[PDB]
Amino acid sequence: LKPTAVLRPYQEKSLRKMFGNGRARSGVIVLPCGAGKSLVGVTAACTVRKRCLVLGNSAVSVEQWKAQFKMWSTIDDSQICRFTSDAKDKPIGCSVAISTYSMLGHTTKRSWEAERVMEWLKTQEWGLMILDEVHTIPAKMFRRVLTIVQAHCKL
DNA sequence: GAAGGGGGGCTATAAAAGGGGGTGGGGGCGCGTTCGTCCTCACTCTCTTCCGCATCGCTGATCGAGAATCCCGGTGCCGAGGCCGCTCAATTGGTCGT
């Protein structure tokens, strides 16, 4: 996390409660959009320091997350990839991945190119799995993502 | 007109002077064959935009078929026209007691 990032007390409390010890605890953090939930997610990734997967409910959110990661973290643009049907960044070429539940949770036949990344995603283990707007997660298709992706801790 | 004869100019030679034109020298330029270029165009060959199917949030609408009514069988009641049993009440009378 670049020192430009400013962390508010409630944000710090939520992170301290999530990182009660040297081991990250899985669970849900409820913060308003104006409260900078994105920064907490980025901070958690910077804390875990391991390969992480961010999933948004829309392509607009995926764009927002990319901007926020660049805005708040030392990570370079090439190190971030937005695995999406509409756009390609050679996800296998970098460690940080961003996508959507509609893509990974997709029930119908995958495109040959998207299948390449998904198999790489399936085989790799994710240290942190950030889920945005998790109120949608209990959906029958979206919850499948949790069985498809292998993640050590999910926030 | 036929033709020959005479006078004068040309021709050369030297020399100087100062000046203009006659000449060929180098020259600029336009013209023009030659050529490819930059270029339009009309063929058309790739990046791109975008239509498609399933899913979400939340609700309504259709749906079959278990079930609110409708309906089968019992209660009884009182409806109905039998009828009898029997009583009472209406009638007569006399009797006679209170």
From Swiss-Prot:
Changing residue 37 to R: Dominant-negative effect on transcription and NER, induces chromatin collapse, probably has no ATPase activity. No transcriptional activity of the reconstituted TFIIH complex. TFHHI is inactive in DNA repair and in transcription. ATP binds at residues 31-38. It is found in: Nucleus. Dephosphorylation reactivates the 5'-excision step. Phosphorylation has no effect on transcription or the 3'-5' helicase activity. Residues 18-155 form the Helicase ATP-binding domain. A motif (DEVH box) lies at residues 132-135. Component of the 7-subunit TFIIH core complex composed of XPB/ERCC3, XPD/ERCC2, GTF2H1, GTF2H2, GTF2H3, GTF2H4 and GTF2H5, which is active in NER. The core complex associates with the 3-subunit CDK-activating kinase (CAK) module composed of CCNH/cyclin H, CDK7 and MNAT1 to form the 10-subunit holoenzyme (holo-TFIIH) active in transcription. Interacts with PUF60. Interacts with ATF7IP. Interacts with KAT2A; leading to KAT2A recruitment to promoters and acetylation of histones. (Microbial infection) Interacts with Epstein-Barr virus EBNA2. ATP-dependent 3'-5' DNA helicase/translocase. Binds dsDNA rather than ssDNA, unzipping it in a translocase rather than classical helicase activity. Component of the general transcription and DNA repair factor IIH (TFIIH) core complex. When complexed to CDK-activating kinase (CAK), involved in RNA transcription by RNA polymerase II. The ATPase activity of XPB/ERCC3, but not its helicase activity, is required for DNA opening; it may wrap around the damaged DNA wedging it open, causing localized melting that allows XPD/ERCC2 helicase to anchor. Belongs to the helicase family. RAD25/XPB subfamily. This is General transcription and DNA repair factor IIH helicase/translocase subunit XPB. It comes from Homo sapiens (Human).
